[PDB]
Design a protein around this ligand. Sequence first.
Ligand SMILES: [K+]
Lengths: 128, 130
Amino acid sequence: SKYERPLKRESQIKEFELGTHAAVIEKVQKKRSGNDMFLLSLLGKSNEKGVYFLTFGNDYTEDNLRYILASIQDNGVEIPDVDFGYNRETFEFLKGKDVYIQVEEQEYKGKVKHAVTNFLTQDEFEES
Amino acid sequence: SKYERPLKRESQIKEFELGTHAAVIEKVQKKRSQKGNDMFLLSLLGKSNEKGVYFLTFGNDYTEDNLRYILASIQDNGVEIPDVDFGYNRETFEFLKGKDVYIQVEEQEYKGKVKHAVTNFLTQDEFEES
Ligand SMILES: [K+]
């Protein structure tokens, strides 16, 4: 057969549209950049797919996890008295928790994506 | 203008087809039956945006086993089951939310008319068999 540039595969994977969304942290995976990381897979109400990298070791680590925990808290889950950080308690705790999320567009290397940027509180979600 | 019947629209409420599906427990709602049994109503969202429901009834002989089946399915989708007494309580209500499961849809009869209904929660093995 004469070669013919094939059509792009998985063009119709559901991604989040711009704005705020009620989502679930469907999955959590361990990763490494040097930096220790949790990869958070996010699932939308219409099976939209997004990801968020929680990076440990830096200055924003504590705050970034707090917002996640507050968003979980505001989706009707009690935050226990655990030492939250790069540990197994946290890894397990984040799996299958409802959240509010913010989705903005993000340029990288020419093309544009829809990136999950922040985890929102009840108040910040209701604003939008 | 003279009347012409508009074509049937699409159900934005797309129901589950028959057979087996992977889904997530999207929502849990506190209810009470007509008899007076406490109930959890589980909204299930399939991978193709299908939407079904399930009534977990407490205070009968089928309650304890029904939870095992749900909690086993949650366990096999990679979530550790905590050390709590499961029942009509905050800890159960909160835990079930947001969890991936395997379900089995079948034909049932509501007031005589047939409908697609979520019947069982499958372990990993059972899912693959289908
Ligand atoms: K029409």
